[PDB]
Amino acid sequence: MSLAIEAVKDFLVKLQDDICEALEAEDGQATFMEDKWTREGGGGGRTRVMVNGAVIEKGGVNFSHVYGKGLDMTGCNFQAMGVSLVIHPKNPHVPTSHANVRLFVAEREGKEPVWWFGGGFDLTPYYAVEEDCRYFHQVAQDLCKPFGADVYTRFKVWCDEYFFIPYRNEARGIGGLFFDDLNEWPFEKCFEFVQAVGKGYIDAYIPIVNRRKNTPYTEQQVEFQEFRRGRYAEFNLVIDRGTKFGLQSGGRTESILISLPPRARWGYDWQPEPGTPEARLTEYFLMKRQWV
């Protein structure tokens, strides 16, 4: 399946381009800076990063083709290619977001290639808006419609289960889609599904940036944003499996940690003030888990 892989690479390259261009247009001011790299004895990647925009303070949209020999498949030729992104806006009234689309292929002697897709997208509000949370989920529900009646529900749930900090009993955001080990449908339907997912992120997230980017904000709201960003760093550094594999397997550190916020705050037993719009993020929005 070398031709399938080439088709998938080409899609991801174009997806990265389209996602960067969409965000650039919406930012108006900053542009993404390209960083092409390689790894000894493996493939490499293209890391595109935006800093200090009029909207996006720290954005990353990375492509990587990771390789290697050896991960029953134990010494199998393993291969992973995907696009990963995290956008951290300046204005707390614009949510942070994240998306992933990735293919994994493992090849053995005397076996057909084992392949699966993975990915999803999700929204991480600070000062959430009811209309945006359901809109975000509606986009996700709509794109799933052609692929099965269970597909939104299954991957919406997976997203809630995965993006969870068990030790704080707390969701990371309001969810969206998450899936892994996807190979239950023929390859082509799977590939179309991740294509829809990549398209979905733009359809879901960009309008929300447009609606909210000019909401006025105070230094107090920035401060809360930064404490909420401690929760983001905690998940990525302690829990997230991809980040954990990337760092422990000697992947490209700065390409892997584009996810981290431009600044974070921690305090002993820090809690938002009760009865505020700050408290309602965790008391209501991160708790509802029912949007469509």
> Measured from the CB of residue 73, what is the shortest distance to a copy of itself in angstroms?
25
Task: Name the residue nearer to a copy of itself (CB basis): 92 or 200.
Answer: 92
If the CB atoms of residues 201 and 232 are measured against a copy of itself, the closer one turns out to be 232
- Residue pair 61/20 in contact by the 8 Å Cβ criterion: yes
**Cα distance between residue 156 and residue 162, in whole Å:** 10
CB 287 within 8 A of CB 175: no
Residue 136's alpha-carbon distances to 193, 238, 251, 291, in angstroms, are 17, 27, 32, 9
Q: How distant is the alpha carbon of residue 59 from its chain centre?
A: 11
Element (H, E) at 152: helix 151-162
For residues 91 and 236, which CB has a smaller minimum distance to a copy of itself in the complex? 236
**Nearer of residues 49 and 182 to a copy of itself, judged by Cβ:** 49
Give the residue before each break in the chain, using a C-to-N cut-off of over 2.5 angstroms; say none if it is continuous.
71
Distance CA 271, CA 116 (A): 41
3-state DSSP assignment of residue 101: strand
Shortest gap between Cβ of 237 and a copy of itself (angstroms)?
4
Handedness of CA 239, 244, 118, 194 (dihedral sign): positive
Closest contact distance (angstroms) between CB of 249 and a copy of itself is 9
Residue 153 beta carbon to a copy of itself: minimum distance, rounded to whole angstroms: 29
Structural contact between residues 33 and 52, judged by C-beta atoms closer than 8 angstroms:
no
First-to-final CA distance of the chain:
38
Reading the block at residue 207, the tokens are 């309008």
Site residues, a copy of itself (CB under 8 A)? 35, 47, 49, 51, 58, 60, 166-168, 226, 230, 233-234, 237-238, 244, 247-248, 250-251, 253-254, 257-258, 260-269
Residues acting as catalytic residues: 98
Least distance (Å) between residue 75 CB and a copy of itself: 24
**Shorter beta-carbon distance to a copy of itself: residue 41 or 110:** 41
